[PDB]
Predict the 3D structure of the following.
Amino acid sequence: TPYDPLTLWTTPDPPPNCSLIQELDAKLTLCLTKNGSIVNGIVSLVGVKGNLLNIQSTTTTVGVHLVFDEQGRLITSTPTALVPQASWGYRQGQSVSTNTVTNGLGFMPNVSAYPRPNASEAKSQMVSLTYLQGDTSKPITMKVAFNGITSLNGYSLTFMWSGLSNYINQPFSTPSCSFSYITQE
Amino acid sequence: TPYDPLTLWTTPDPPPNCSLIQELDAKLTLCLTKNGSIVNGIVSLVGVKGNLLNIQSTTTTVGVHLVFDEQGRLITSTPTALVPQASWGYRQGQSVSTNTVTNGLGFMPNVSAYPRPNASEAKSQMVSLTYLQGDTSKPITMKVAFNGITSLNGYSLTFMWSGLSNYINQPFSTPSCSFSYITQE
Amino acid sequence: TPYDPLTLWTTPDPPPNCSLIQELDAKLTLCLTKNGSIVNGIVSLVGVKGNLLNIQSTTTTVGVHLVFDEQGRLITSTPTALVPQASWGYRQGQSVSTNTVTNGLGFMPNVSAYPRPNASEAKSQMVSLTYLQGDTSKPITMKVAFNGITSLNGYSLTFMWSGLSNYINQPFSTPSCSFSYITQE
Amino acid sequence: GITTPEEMIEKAKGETAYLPCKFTLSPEDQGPLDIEWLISPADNQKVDQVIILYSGDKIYDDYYPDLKGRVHFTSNDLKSGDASINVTNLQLSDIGTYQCKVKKAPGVANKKIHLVVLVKPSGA
Amino acid sequence: GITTPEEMIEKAKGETAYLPCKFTLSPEDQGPLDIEWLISPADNQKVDQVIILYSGDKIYDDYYPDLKGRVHFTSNDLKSGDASINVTNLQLSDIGTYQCKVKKAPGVANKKIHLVVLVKPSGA
Amino acid sequence: GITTPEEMIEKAKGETAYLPCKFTLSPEDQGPLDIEWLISPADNQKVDQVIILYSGDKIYDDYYPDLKGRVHFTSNDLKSGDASINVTNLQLSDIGTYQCKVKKAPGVANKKIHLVVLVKPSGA
């Protein structure tokens, strides 16, 4: 196989691929690898245009969602952060394969473990402390919610970087942040 | 194979399966996946009855242990948290396979790396900061000790959620917490 | 195969294998397992001789680097921490295989994701909070930089444990710390 | 599995609600039997709250305070394939989705019942 | 891939620099076309700064403030295989490594140009 | 591997203890030879403390302060298969488990010796 069926990513160095506040104003690098019932994930977000380059005084949180359908295939429409033309799929070299994901449920967060109506439940969350800029003097929290911004028969991943309130005139930028979850299949 | 030999879990949505303070007063969701010499684990604990629903003023720590024998098979007796009838074994669908684990040492914490008499050694520990309720205003610490509550030829996993002292009239509940360790085999 | 091609480690219980401040004054236990495009890693460092047993008043940071060549093979010379005779390679039992690593790029940090000149970029970093001694009263930070102490066509891993300033007459010792990164191949 | 689909039961305050949950077991389902009923109250934000449980051949109740003493399995032989329960003297607070989980490793099934309670009779 | 190696372009302040980036597409490269130009200024510490972009059949500029209005693709048909750009009225601040990334999943290519700007003509 | 099982050596204060650790090498063990002796003192909580080491054809001592100058390999040719050591002028503080680790990748072996020191002679 030319591609790796155990990995779904945005490629290691994506171009601006999100229009969070304004058109293509951010780069979301996300890689998901399936290891049995657990997905090892590494996410990273950085502002490249507009307010994301200069965190507004009132901003306390910056977040993105990835909503998938019942086959685990990403849906490129609000509120999914990645734009329609953005790379997302099996890994093939430093790029993405053009094949459609046919084992998508292997990467989706398990709904028995994280019921769609349970996003507020601590268990549907994996919360950690990290640092803006990667600067240890600028602590922030990262919360990953599982299936909280769902449909039905659908799945989702939500990433919230909070505690930004006290960080101004700084571009929004996170370190590579790790996380994991039990898989649907 | 109907089941996955690389995963050992309690199923994604177990029923009360621990009698920590009183009979079946808690739900422990635990999933372990073997990735070569490292096990990726995700644990979550939540009180459902008794004092675990209302953290006592004096409570500073809540913890559970899982003790395994020389074949890596779980021992369902004190101090193992999971009750005898609780699901634990290879993953098969959203449930557990009835087969006996025959590759258990592949999921056990390596005793050369984490000697039975070394539980107090920093290396036999993986400590992280997390949050009660998943609420970023309620920071707590999670310490996973490897082979500290052992036998001989035996293995164990210990989970301590501490710093609870200042959290009252709140049910005890953790977010899905990640951890990992080098495997015996 | 006698060895595991998906794991590269220093063995679970290495002897003093680093001469950080003075000859063989430290033990670095490191295990890397390849899970598709992501490496799950667990590192641990402990002083056994000299100033590393009694953190100097002025010490604020303790760190180590591992520099690899274009084939992902470790280079045992400054600034690589592991000494020339130290074990490092595929896992075989509780030891290391004598075979040369031929799939090294599968364990190297992806240069597209972590460009050699980008070590200062938050994305080339994975920063977390942890504790000296594993003692939750002694918080410290761990920063893993990807390809920051590189060559060209080369790769590297850097581990910095900072915030030590206020910890004296204590031997330097970390808990088993987890981390992960996207792989070159 | 469970013999009935997700349903909506509409009752009147004071009446008793019968929440049916019958199941069939497969030859493969050789693991111990567990029956758990959870509830997601409409009045508050709690979800999947344990109401009553059948584990290790024993019944465990007294999990959900507001429902104390008003919940009991209807059958006198659960193992036979009937996990049904009754909620006596319904109150408006009882409104919400009640879920029945029947497990016999590797077997697992669940059913959701949306219970509605009306001040006085009529769904007319 | 891109038709030219990593090169060094030496110009004089005020002049215009032509940064060539021509590419060929493979039959396999069936994914959407993306063209991104980044810059790592010599004067400061920033690296890989987005300068101009071609995504979803549209051009996006205005990313790097100091280079505003002085960057444009040279070709009027990028898809044909020419991602070249011009940096007009060069200033000493423009010195740095400019990178051209041309992507058509699974295809990906990049070229690095080290641009040098001199106060007055001469590399003699 | 090491030629002797885990044993208990009982000596008297002042005497010298001979901690035997002889090993045989396999043809497969083609990696460099490492010999490390660790100790877990009975009097304190420390475990696996490095006492003496043989790495890269050199001896390294001076790790465990309280045992300074009282530990030396007994053989004048370790590579031949003898990692034994002597602990001279035993003190009550020397009580604890001493471990001998002999490694030659992929080969690895270890032996544990429980050393007991008595104020005055007698185990009678």
